[PDB]
Design a protein around this ligand. Structure first.
Ligand SMILES: Nc1ncnc2c1ncn2[C@@H]1O[C@H](COP(=O)(O)OP(=O)(O)O)[C@@H](O)[C@H]1O
Ligand SMILES: Nc1ncnc2c1ncn2[C@@H]1O[C@H](COP(=O)(O)OP(=O)(O)O)[C@@H](O)[C@H]1O
Ligand SMILES: Nc1ncnc2c1ncn2[C@@H]1O[C@H](COP(=O)(O)OP(=O)(O)O)[C@@H](O)[C@H]1O
Ligand SMILES: [Mg+2]
Ligand SMILES: [Mg+2]
Ligand SMILES: [Mg+2]
Lengths: 373, 371, 371
């Protein structure tokens, strides 16, 4: 912490989850969803004795969502409802949760790359025009991964809730032109899972329902390692079928949808998106890099963001890269592939915007923070 | 006290102490400027990387050479190379140590003057001397007669010497040398579809040339065989593991030395150029300039290049006298070894340039001690 | 009897009968295959659209271009384009008509050989020839000497010519052209909050490149003035009726040609490339090339490109030389009009690869007869 005793905070401003903690903490103290919402009377629900404020925000708006019409202020990394966005931060720093409650302590911001410039600039306005912060910085979202991982060279794969990014960094140099986006992220996988359950005859349609299929997604879904083996095991045997309990207690059952939904990351054509799956977009990025740098990117693939948590994703991802390298570099000279040293950093800790390297290793007291000006 | 010996070649700098048998440091004469913005703390970036530090990191660095065709063209890089030479490779304080430098012949006098100035005016050397690269090779090969053939990365030059006396009027120089054979290889590889482009890749094309190319003993016969047999095709493995197959290209590259028309210039090949030099010398000494044809420099390392020379010179010379190329194993460092001899010898100390004389007379002194 | 002139460049295919003044047909070299399952049995038959159908149906098609950087990459799709060219677009069957194809320099020879094999085996043409695209552009001008600059969709290259002699060593090429300028526009529009990502939408971003972008005569003045006011903020309609409007993105894309470091390539821009090629030419040619820069190809259509290029070379070249830039009004068709002139030429009627010569030598004949 500062020699002035000031504290420093990180907000990921995540499109789905705000994630907050003090500088140097190995954990966030508070994880909560970015929902903001208003009370709505619904026929299908008994109105409780629990008091509902005229604006619920954050974790409270998630548990009481059954009474609430909920918005996300952030979509695909761009603020799309600026008033709820203000109210989400006004909740974050208030007496509740991360009670700094003050101008004096510093905040780090994380912006996605290739972000429409006005989005960045309005944040830098309100941080100094409303909270009147004493210290602010906006960091390249990709580099924070490598700071936390303790690396300087590697290609960062960063699938959040809103958008997926790939960003190479080579020995600390930013290579910008090798940036890529893929418009598949945790939100689209959720909507696609809604459709897959609709075929199985469960209807979900309320905004309060979106959180429920997210909780389904997080607990039952996984990425197929050999997609042919998953399909045969679904066709031949019943074991993939598993139960879940909805809020009203309906004991719904879900089957091969557990893997058919996450697979969209490798097959964007299952959703409407026309492109290439995460593995092939990652491979084309490395192949575009200058020829000597490729040798290191294959050894330092680095994973970030909650949509990378799906069981088996590192294993599936490694398979597609090995097969791509066999097909297109070794030109099918199969036995040579024993020489292809490839490695994926997939550390089980993977809310990978932790703050240690970005704050305390960058300043205890310094002229780097932007300041009131 | 011990002198330093330094061969400031375009291509590879070679430096070491006098009286040692081989250079103590060899490193590429490249200064790299990072072409991308750094973003990380703890990176340790700086305004430039040099030598092995640059070669080993070129995926970020726009490599440029300071020396073009044997002329120093950017003193603000060359000063950094010399700085790297003394303090990082040899780890020596220069003000203690006099130094023998090298130059090619027919090099513009402004280059030699600025070079001697930088030595006294910034590194504060006690004393120094400038020797012609060719001349040192006869020291290395231990003899006092021969037409020296020396070919670096940036110059090919020929210097007939007899009875210890040089014949300046018969000096012949060509700018076709190792780098133009690298660009040529980089051009012709486009025929097989390898699009090597930009400076960080040119160093890879060099690594192919430095390992797969060879000199044909009968060019059109090798062409006909390459056009009909895969025996001459070889394969090389790129840094990402993409293998490539090379053939016909392998010998069509260094053939350029014997047919400079391949790179578009109408000067005669090195064989005709060496023969011209002999035929321009005095009649009596020709009979043993056809012996003692001493090769030097890394561009003479190609397999068979000694033999192709012997064949073609024999086809040009009268048959009643005998050609014999001299081609040491050490020839890549022969120039430096020749300096390592010369700087160690007695009878050289009284003919350094010394800082007292330099400040008295200025850099125009080089034309009155050196050759 | 009559020859066919067929500029199978990347981007837009151009074909027509020799001697005609402008192409009979031009259409995009794209093959469009359906990205949804074909399910309306009946009219919805076609499994692969080519050309103007694919360009039109693009909403449902994954368009792809079978020529990448001037190198043909999918030969089955390329065959469909030629088949479309002869039987559907020209409506003349190939068996009676010799074909003039044309190609960029330093392409892999395998491209030239297979293109010929397809011509004799599949379309069964009487004879054919493969001119280099640059000299065709020089013919169209009615010009005996000049330095040609073709800037296609996929390749930009300089070829200097004097008295109709070519200078192969001075040929130089850059793989940056109208495609990568479009892909860069398809990034920088995201800075403003649009998003184009599908292959069909890349056709819309090309369209806006043609209509709104221009080369800055003074880029840093243009940047500073663009920040002052909406005076540049031109507006354009998407097919959906969404309206987009653009500021400094108008010139930042064209500027990539002069500062390739925007797309991260290390090569110099087209101005410094042009001057570098003249410096490779023989010295007495140079004065006459400065008076006869001839621009060609669609990428040279941007407003002000002739003036900007003149300014850059005038600064870079010796101040006594009179730099002028030949930018014909019709220069988009210059390559095809040049072919139409060559295929009419009474001397050229000997130069064809005639069928029996391929029947003798196989595909390798192209390296004997063609330039
Ligand atoms: N264990 C898990 N398995 C699968 N998905 C998860 C898991 N944990 C979180 N997610 C998903 O990851 C997304 C949130 O990730 P996060 O990194 O917080 O995105 P952002 O930081 O951009 O808000 C949500 O879609 C959430 O459902
Ligand atoms: N084994 C080899 N085969 C072919 N060419 C070589 C080989 N080794 C080096 N070369 C070429 O010979 C050149 C010689 O340059 P160098 O010897 O440094 O010149 P100088 O005589 O000025 O020191 C090298 O730059 C390289 O291009
Ligand atoms: N004003 C313009 N009119 C037409 N095409 C233009 C214009 N400006 C730029 N272009 C671009 O020029 C390219 C067409 O060049 P093309 O004729 O294909 O060259 P080549 O056929 O030699 O490859 C396309 O990318 C097109 O967008
Ligand atoms: Mg996130
Ligand atoms: Mg040397
Ligand atoms: Mg063209």
């Amino acid at each position: 912490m500062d020699s002035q005793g000031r504290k420093v905070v990180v907000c990921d401003n995540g499109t789905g989850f705000v994630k907050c903690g003090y500088a140097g903490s190995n954990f966030p103290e508070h994880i909560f969803p970015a929902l903001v919402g208003r009370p709505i009377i619904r026929s299908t629900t008994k109105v409780g004795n629990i008091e509902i404020k005229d604006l619920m925000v954050g974790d409270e708006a998630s548990e009481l969502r059954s009474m609430l019409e909920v918005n996300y202020p952030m979509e695909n990394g761009i603020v799309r409802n600026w008033d709820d966005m203000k109210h989400l931060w006004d909740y974050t720093f208030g007496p509740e949760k991360l009670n700094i409650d003050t101008r004096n302590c510093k905040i780090l911001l994380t912006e996605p790359p290739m972000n429409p410039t006005k989005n960045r600039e309005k944040i830098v306005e309100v941080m100094f025009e409303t909270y009147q912060f004493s210290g602010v910085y906006v960091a390249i979202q990709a580099v924070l991964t490598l700071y936390a991982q303790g690396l300087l060279t590697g290609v960062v794969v960063d699938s959040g809730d809103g958008v997926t990014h790939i960003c190479p960094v080579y020995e600390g140099f930013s290579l910008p032109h090798l940036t890529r986006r893929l418009d598949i992220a945790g939100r689209d996988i959720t909507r696609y899972l809604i459709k897959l359950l609709l075929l199985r005859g469960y209807a979900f349609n309320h905004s309060a329902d979106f959180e429920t299929v997210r909780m389904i997604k997080e607990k039952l879904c996984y990425v197929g390692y050999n997609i042919e083996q998953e399909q045969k095991l679904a066709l031949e045997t019943t074991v993939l079928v598993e139960s879940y309990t909805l809020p009203d207690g309906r004991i719904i059952k879900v089957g091969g949808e557990r893997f058919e939904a996450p697979e969209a990351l490798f097959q964007p054509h299952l959703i409407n998106v026309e492109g290439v799956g995460v593995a092939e977009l990652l491979f084309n990025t490395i192949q575009a890099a200058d020829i000597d740098t490729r040798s290191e990117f294959y050894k330092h693939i680095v994973l970030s963001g909650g949509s990378t948590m799906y069981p088996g994703l590192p294993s599936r991802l490694e398979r597609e890269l090995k097969q791509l390298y066999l097909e297109r570099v070794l030109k099918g000279d199969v036995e040579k592939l024993s020489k292809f040293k490839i490695r994926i950093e997939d550390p089980p800790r993977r809310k990978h915007m932790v703050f240690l390297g970005g704050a305390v290793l960058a300043d205890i007291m310094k002229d780097k923070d932007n300041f009131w000006m | 006290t011990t002198a330093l010996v330094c061969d400031n070649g375009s291509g590879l700098v070679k430096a070491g102490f006098a009286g040692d048998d081989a250079p103590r440091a060899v490193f590429p004469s490249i200064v790299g400027r990072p072409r991308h913005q750094g973003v990380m703390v703890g990176m340790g970036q700086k305004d430039s990387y040099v030598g092995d530090e640059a070669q080993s990191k070129r995926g970020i660095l726009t490599l440029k050479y300071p020396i073009e065709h044997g002329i120093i063209t950017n003193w603000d890089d060359m000063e950094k190379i010399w700085h790297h030479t003394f303090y990082n490779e040899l780890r020596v304080a220069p003000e203690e140590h006099p130094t023998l430098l090298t130059e090619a012949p027919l090099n513009p006098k402004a280059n030699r003057e600025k070079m001697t100035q930088i030595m006294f005016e910034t590194f504060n050397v006690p004393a120094m001397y400038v020797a012609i690269q060719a001349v040192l090779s006869l020291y290395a090969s231990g003899r006092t007669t021969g037409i020296v053939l020396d070919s670096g990365d940036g110059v090919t030059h020929n210097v007939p010497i007899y009875e210890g006396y040089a014949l300046p009027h018969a000096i012949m120089r060509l700018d076709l040398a190792g780098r133009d054979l690298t660009d040529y290889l980089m051009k012709i590889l486009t025929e097989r579809g390898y699009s090597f482009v930009t400076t960080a890749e040119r160093e890879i094309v060099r690594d192919i040339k430095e390992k797969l190319c060879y000199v044909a003993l009968d060019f059109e016969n090798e062409m006909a065989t390459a056009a009909s047999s895969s025996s001459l095709e070889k394969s090389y493995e790129l840094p990402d593991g993409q293998v490539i197959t090379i053939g016909n290209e392998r010998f069509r590259c260094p053939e350029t030395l014997f047919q400079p028309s391949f790179i578009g210039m109408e000067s005669a090949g090195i064989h005709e150029t060496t023969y011209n030099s002999i035929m321009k010398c005095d009649i009596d000494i020709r009979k043993d300039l056809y012996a003692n044809n001493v090769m030097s420099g890394g561009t003479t390392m190609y397999p068979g290049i000694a033999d192709r020379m012997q064949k073609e010179i024999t086809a040009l010379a009268p048959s009643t006298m005998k050609i014999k190329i001299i081609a040491p194993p050490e020839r890549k460092y022969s120039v430096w070894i020749g300096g390592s001899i010369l700087a160690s010898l007695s009878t050289f100390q009284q003919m350094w340039i010394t800082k007292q004389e330099y400040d008295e007379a200025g850099p125009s002194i080089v034309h009155r001690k050196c050759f």
